[PDB]
């Protein structure tokens, strides 16, 4: 937002924290601003309607 980062990735990118273990998702822009590690569970987008 407004070319600035709203927490989470912001916390990593402002040297406040050192990792962000959780439920992050890999993306082009996200991997562009902060390095990543090897993915450890497959995921994507899925459809689910009752």
């Amino acid at each position: 937002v407004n070319n600035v980062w709203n927490g989470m990735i912001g916390e990593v990118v402002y040297q406040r924290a050192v990792m962000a273990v959780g439920s992050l998702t890999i993306n082009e822009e996200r991997s562009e601003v902060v390095d990543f590690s090897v993915p450890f569970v497959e995921t994507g987008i899925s459809v689910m309607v009752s």
Partner: protein, 48 residues
């Protein structure tokens, strides 16, 4: 590794023993070892 290749673009499933000293990119597939077997023809007779 012995300076004889620079690109390795072919199925090269990532493993610890390889990535110890080698560079990898984000995977472009998602595989997993399974088991293979052949099927059988007869299931019903209708002639007994």
């Amino acid at each position: 590794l012995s300076g004889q290749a620079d690109m390795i673009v072919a199925p090269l499933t990532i493993n610890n023993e390889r990535a110890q000293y080698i560079e990898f990119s984000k995977p472009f597939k998602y595989q997993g070892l399974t088991i293979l077997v052949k099927k059988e023809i007869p299931r019903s007779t209708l002639d007994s």
